[PDB]
User: Fold ntpase P4 from Bacteriophage phi-12.
Amino acid sequence: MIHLYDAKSFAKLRAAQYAAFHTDAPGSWFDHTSGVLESVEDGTPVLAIGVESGDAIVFDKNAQRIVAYKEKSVKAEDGSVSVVQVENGFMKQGHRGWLVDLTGELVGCSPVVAEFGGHRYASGMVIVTGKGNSGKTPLVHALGEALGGKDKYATVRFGEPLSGYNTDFNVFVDDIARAMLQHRVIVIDSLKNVIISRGAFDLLSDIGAMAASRGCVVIASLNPTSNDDKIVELVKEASRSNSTSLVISTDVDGEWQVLTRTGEGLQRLTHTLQTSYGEHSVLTIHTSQASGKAIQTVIKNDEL
Amino acid sequence: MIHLYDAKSFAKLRAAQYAAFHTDAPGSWFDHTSGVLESVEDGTPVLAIGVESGDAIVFDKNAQRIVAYKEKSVKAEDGSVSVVQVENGFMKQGHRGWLVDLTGELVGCSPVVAEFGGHRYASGMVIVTGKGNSGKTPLVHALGEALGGKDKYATVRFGEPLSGYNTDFNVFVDDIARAMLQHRVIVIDSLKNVIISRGAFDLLSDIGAMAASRGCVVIASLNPTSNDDKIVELVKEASRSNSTSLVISTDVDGEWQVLTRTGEGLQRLTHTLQTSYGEHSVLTIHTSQASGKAIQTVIKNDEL
Amino acid sequence: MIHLYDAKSFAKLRAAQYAAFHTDAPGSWFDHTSGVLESVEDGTPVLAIGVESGDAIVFDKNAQRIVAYKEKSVKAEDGSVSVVQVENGFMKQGHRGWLVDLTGELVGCSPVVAEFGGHRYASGMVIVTGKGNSGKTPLVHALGEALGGKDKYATVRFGEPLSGYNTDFNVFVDDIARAMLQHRVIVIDSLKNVIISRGAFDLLSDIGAMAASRGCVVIASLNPTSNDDKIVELVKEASRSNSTSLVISTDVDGEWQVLTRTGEGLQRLTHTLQTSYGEHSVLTIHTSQASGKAIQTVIKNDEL
Amino acid sequence: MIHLYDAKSFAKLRAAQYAAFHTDAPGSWFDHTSGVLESVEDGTPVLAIGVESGDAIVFDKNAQRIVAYKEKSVKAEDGSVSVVQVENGFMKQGHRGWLVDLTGELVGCSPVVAEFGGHRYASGMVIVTGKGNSGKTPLVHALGEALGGKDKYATVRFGEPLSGYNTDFNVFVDDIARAMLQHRVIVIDSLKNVIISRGAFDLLSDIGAMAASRGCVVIASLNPTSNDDKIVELVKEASRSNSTSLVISTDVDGEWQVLTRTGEGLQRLTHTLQTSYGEHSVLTIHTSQASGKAIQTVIKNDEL
Amino acid sequence: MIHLYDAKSFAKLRAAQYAAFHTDAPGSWFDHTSGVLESVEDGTPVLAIGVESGDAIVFDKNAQRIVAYKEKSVKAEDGSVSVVQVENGFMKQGHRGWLVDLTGELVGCSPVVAEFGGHRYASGMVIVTGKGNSGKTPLVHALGEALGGKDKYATVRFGEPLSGYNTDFNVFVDDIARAMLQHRVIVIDSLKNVIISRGAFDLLSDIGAMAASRGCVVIASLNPTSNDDKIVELVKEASRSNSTSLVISTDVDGEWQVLTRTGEGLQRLTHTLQTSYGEHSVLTIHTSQASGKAIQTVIKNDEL
Amino acid sequence: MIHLYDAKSFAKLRAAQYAAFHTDAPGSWFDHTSGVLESVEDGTPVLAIGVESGDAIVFDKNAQRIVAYKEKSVKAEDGSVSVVQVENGFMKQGHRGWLVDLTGELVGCSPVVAEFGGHRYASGMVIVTGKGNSGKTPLVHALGEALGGKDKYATVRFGEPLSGYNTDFNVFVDDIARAMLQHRVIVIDSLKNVIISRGAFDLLSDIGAMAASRGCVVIASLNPTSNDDKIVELVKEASRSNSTSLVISTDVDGEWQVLTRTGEGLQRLTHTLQTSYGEHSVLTIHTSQASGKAIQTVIKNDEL
Ligand SMILES: Nc1ncnc2c1ncn2[C@@H]1O[C@H](COP(=O)(O)CP(=O)(O)OP(=O)(O)O)[C@@H](O)[C@H]1O
Ligand SMILES: Nc1ncnc2c1ncn2[C@@H]1O[C@H](COP(=O)(O)CP(=O)(O)OP(=O)(O)O)[C@@H](O)[C@H]1O
Ligand SMILES: Nc1ncnc2c1ncn2[C@@H]1O[C@H](COP(=O)(O)CP(=O)(O)OP(=O)(O)O)[C@@H](O)[C@H]1O
Ligand SMILES: Nc1ncnc2c1ncn2[C@@H]1O[C@H](COP(=O)(O)CP(=O)(O)OP(=O)(O)O)[C@@H](O)[C@H]1O
Ligand SMILES: Nc1ncnc2c1ncn2[C@@H]1O[C@H](COP(=O)(O)CP(=O)(O)OP(=O)(O)O)[C@@H](O)[C@H]1O
Ligand SMILES: Nc1ncnc2c1ncn2[C@@H]1O[C@H](COP(=O)(O)CP(=O)(O)OP(=O)(O)O)[C@@H](O)[C@H]1O
Ligand SMILES: [Mn+2]
Ligand SMILES: [Mn+2]
Ligand SMILES: [Mn+2]
Ligand SMILES: [Mn+2]
Ligand SMILES: [Mn+2]
Ligand SMILES: [Mn+2]
Assistant:
């Protein structure tokens, strides 16, 4: 909805967003939204996501698709009205994204999803990319495990010429919706095939906001390597504008840079990561600040 | 509609447009149009804005969507006829924009929306953009608070990978329409995702006139940073031709340049702004002229 | 229709075309076509113009839209047949342009529309463009007042982020049609937003011929400023091929060059204009020649 | 249809094509096809041409459109079958071009349309183009008059911002079809607006074959001047591949080069033309050989 | 269908493909397939070729179009099922190409179509192209006569601005289909207008296999001369990948190079041709080896 | 489906993937999946593959198309639901790929398909490409025979102007589906014509995963040779991202480099092959390693 502010309320909003990242208990936001989702009326539409054609499919709190749901409106605070209607498995009325309010007046946050090795990590979308020899697949799994902490992480596999990999986009959005509805830490191996159809465009522009709203983190690998400025710029734009955080390789093998948006209008943070391989390519991230706009685009050049 | 002029009536118009900006009491035009809107028959269509597909949705004076409205024509002064009809939630007949006359013979103005720190600010669309380290989000909010003055400003959020952010274009135009119907100072955080569908194109070409006609100001952030001459030029065109005013960052951190179109055929004005950060990234614009066409394009180069 | 010629009849045509610009009394053609339009049967379709979609709308002699008109054919001189039919507000059968014969055998002219400061001006489409500090909006209004002479000029406003400006293309063509049906001197402020849909393309290729046939002049502002060779070349093509005349700014502030097509196969004329500003940006054109094809393209370079 | 040959019959075919240009009486072919067209059953479809949409319209021998014609087939020599069917004014079955046989076994000719100033001119399509100061419009009319000889020439006007000019493509194809059905010498002023829709593409690829089959000549002006390699190459291709002859200006004002395809597999001929202006821009071509492929493309460079 | 191989059966295949070109009696494959076609049930579909839209038309063994044919399946050797159905003149079910097995287990051949002047020529598609003064039209006809030998060659004419030339793509595919069903040596004059619609694309990718399967040769002229890397590369690809053989002009007038693919996985052969002109441009090819991949692309450079 | 992991279960997966290539008995996975397919209920859909349009066709365990199959769902482990439905020959509900579970929790593998000359080869999609004189057709057939070992390899022929070659994309996918359903070693000759329609794009992004899941190897020839960065880059992307393995030619004639993806997140291996020709172009691969990301793109440069 729209929000109204004066100096006082805006100052309070910024203090709260700052806290959502810096001081809140890691993963508390996810716990809170999990509570909101489970308290919802059974059969109630909670999430809509775009399939390949640009049409949207809808899920309930248990990640089951809702095929038919007769028109039902809800008047918001600002006086606006939200309407949801599902027919023959497709959203007839409504919008893409969360169909129920998880945030409230608290918008524009990057809820801390976890703390690891002395650093806090934001929820939302994290894109892992870069050129060079440092492997991305091993990195997303190590990050997924590290941020999962006590919890297991969920893995969504898509578009790789390996066994058991789904290559159908519509099955992919189904997997993603189920993952965000049920887990705090999600790994997506290969955004490459989405990088273009309407659904693909919708996903890139929607996923970060969906995850951040839920308080879950989606770690997605994206390879730039494709000297075709048409696609390469799309990679830089996705990394620049649709990612809540960015994890990119450097000149030194095994070393990565983490760039994190800490909230609406807040400063981006950066820290480095050292890693090493053990048996069968299992990667481990070793354990034992503010970056400017210019520095940010400097890292973006790396992918050219 | 169309207007006829001879030397005398043209001179009066220019004198009137000149006063609408330079001498009228700040915000007086918004108050005047609020009165025109509230005098409209209940349920009467007053605003039509395009959704993603290119179709248009219609609202009444209370920002409520009209789903059905049987054909109804009106003959204007120049003998032209306006016809409005709404079926199944979409305009079957009519045009995008204000569906009632808010201006009359007084057209081509940039009504003063507010006065702050010794400067008059124009209603209409203001694009906040540029390259460098100066933050746009903190700036749009400080501007919103400064121009709101005694009134709260309205914030429309869209397309950011942060908690509670809407990413559905159709919800966005709904928020925008409601905001212009009810508030004088509006902040849109991130036009980035509009910059392309029919609705997006309609928005860019319509918002400035809609706001200027209402007497409200829409302060929208736009980031150029995207070395892709296809989009970067679309940003320069939007900053050049779709904005009533432009606020762009300079070589000096915290410093901004304001460029204002003061009316139809009138000169553009320019002034600088110094700013500083307080706690939690809350920005403050410090308190205590004519610019040629060439100087204008010089500022436009900054975005490359 | 098609016309047949031998050397004698061809020479006669050229002599008449030459006269239609050089010696006919200024504005006489407009008066003549006004008489033809008024002698038409009531309810008779006289003008069809394309809307955004590419479909066309129809008007009668009083600039009122015709919504229903059953099939009706008319056999011309060359034996050809013209058929007009209107159904549900749109032309079902017919063509875009004048639906009645305003010219007869006298085609290929640039009928003198007015005389001012010692120079004859041609009816048709006049594009006011160029780069630099000289302002186009003040110029088009000054030209409109000067060529109006004893008569008021009509102003069509479109696509500018100023108050009361329509931004809907279909309302725009309705405004243009009404203008050409009722006035000799017409100003269009901002052809920018048309420069692309089927209707926009239709307007650019049709308006020049429609105005010239009527004997009215349409003075339209068009800004090249947009370093995107895709659009900048479209601007040069409109100025070169869809304009009866061109008014472009020069190296000296306040000075403009007028380039006029005097008739089919005839030479282009050129003269200069000096201007100055008075109060409230009201511009005045001071009072007190054959140019070749190469000199013409040279001027076209100015827009790059 | 398809034709079968052995050395003897091929040699005879080439001798006959050579004669169709070099020794046949100028204009005899047109006279012969005129005879074939007039002997056709009344109401019989003789010509189909594509309108803007790509659909085709059909005419009878008197240039009147056939709106309904029930399926009717004809078995050719090679055993193939030709079918023509018209419904609601559009060809349901058939092909674009002549619907009746005018040539016979004699195909691949450039029938001499006229002789003037000691040179024979081919029927088919002649494109007049080039850069520089030599005027094209005056040239097509002078050529039209010269080749008309004792007969008047027909003029098709399209796409110019001058009075009485049709700018509707469908009216244009109607004018052209009528012209080819009724006259040996045809002038088309401005192919510019066709240079893109389906009908436009169909016209460029069909007109030369239609005219050559009829034995009439279509003199079309085409301006290259448009530094946009997308369109400029289209101009060179139209001049290179869709023109039976080419008339292009040179370095010397008033002088032109004529390049003529003399038949299938035969050599291209070239000759120069000197011209001068009299009153009101009426051009006169003064009165009192084989060119190679390489030389041909050298002339094509002129348009860049 | 699909074929299975082990070292032995693969060796036999290669020996068989090798003989199909090197030792079989010239034209014996065409005779063999004529026999297969004539043994087909009357009215049975034998060939489907794509028209402009992408749809396909079907012919029987006598080159007559089939308009209606109720579904009829056939199980092949590999267990695959072929189904054919024709409704309202268009294939409702089936595939493009030969609808009956003409080859069997003997696939991947370039059957010798004829022997002339001491050289064996392959059936399939032969593209005659190149730059320079050597004429293609005279060459395709001389080749047609030379390879026809005791038989007349068939000539399919398309897209030239000459008398009696068809310019309708659908008539063209009809002529081609008939020609391949009835003659061994076919000449297509001007593939230029195909070089793009679905039908055009289908033709380029299908004709070579269709001819090679039949045992007939299609000799098609193609002109590169069109400095537009978009089309020029389409010509090099067609010459490289869609042609069974290539005949290209050299630096010396009258001299040509012949490049022949001799079979699947077999080496390409090359030989030169000297030619001279007789009367009326009738060309004569004078009478009285292996080439690597790199040499091949070297010849391909000639077209730039 | 989606899978959850902790450090322990992740390590187990990597160990299994590693083994699936390095130590499992060659071809054992294919045998295992053959057993899964045969234990399926008769009439059960097991594979869906996209046709040209983008629609998909379905096959049962015996490679026979299923035309009608009423809705039928299956709930998986992650709680997800799979639904298959076939109507009028096309999938109404389902996804492309394997419609039954061949892998289970064991995903992300490159199952060893065979061992030859001391090297293990991975199942999945293998692209044979490169520039230079080394021939691809002889190589793919030699690789097919070598990896077939005791078994015959299957050959799918497509898009070559040689006898008996199918050129219809829909027949091609039918051939591929049948091949993967029935054989461990498959050769596709000429992926060239797919390199673009929806089905072609579907095949490129799906075949690798389909083959790997089955444990069969698809060896496909692909020629880069086509200096058109639009296609040449598509060739590099297919080799880089849609290939399980890559076989590319080098600077030395007859020598090839094999680059193998050994499993998800595992290292790529590389070895060289020497070859020689025998009679009739029958190629023989002579008998008697970790490569980095950078070394990989280096090899990719070879195709420019
Ligand atoms: N033990 C080890 N030592 C060094 N590198 C290793 C390794 N085990 C795995 N790797 C690296 O892991 C990397 C990633 O594997 P891949 O499946 O190629 C995903 P990626 O390369 O990160 O992204 P991509 O598939 O989009 O190119 C490879 O570069 C591989 O070399
Ligand atoms: N205390 C502080 N001192 C200096 N800069 C601060 C600051 N607090 C916030 N900022 C700046 O606020 C800026 C804007 O926040 P962001 O959310 O990135 C919007 P933006 O960068 O202006 O536009 P964008 O999101 O389209 O790129 C950041 O660049 C950050 O550096
Ligand atoms: N008193 C004055 N002295 C000098 N210039 C004046 C002036 N009053 C107005 N102008 C000029 O009037 C010009 C035109 O006004 P604008 O609204 O910018 C239309 P334009 O610039 O002609 O075309 P545009 O809006 O497409 O760029 C401005 O450039 C302004 O400098
Ligand atoms: N008396 C004369 N002396 C020299 N040139 C003359 C002339 N009379 C007419 N012309 C030339 O006639 C030419 C053609 O007139 P136009 O209407 O511009 C057709 P064009 O220029 O040939 O093609 P175009 O309209 O596509 O550019 C102009 O260049 C004009 O200068
Ligand atoms: N007696 C002769 N001596 C030399 N050349 C001759 C000739 N008779 C004909 N020619 C050549 O025959 C050639 C071919 O005729 P055209 O109809 O132009 C087909 P092309 O030029 O080979 O291909 P194209 O039409 O696609 O450009 C011409 O270039 C002409 O020079
Ligand atoms: N005995 C032999 N000695 C050397 N090379 C041979 C040979 N027999 C066949 N070849 C080579 O086999 C190669 C491949 O045959 P082609 O049909 O051209 C398929 P390709 O070249 O691999 O891919 P392509 O058709 O996409 O270009 C040819 O380049 C030919 O030189
Ligand atoms: Mn990876
Ligand atoms: Mn921002
Ligand atoms: Mn202006
Ligand atoms: Mn002209
Ligand atoms: Mn030719
Ligand atoms: Mn090959």
In short: Chain B has seven helices and 18 strands. Helices of chain B lie at 7-22, 28-38, 136-148, 169-182, 198-214, 229-241, 293-301. The radius of gyration of chain B is 19 Å.
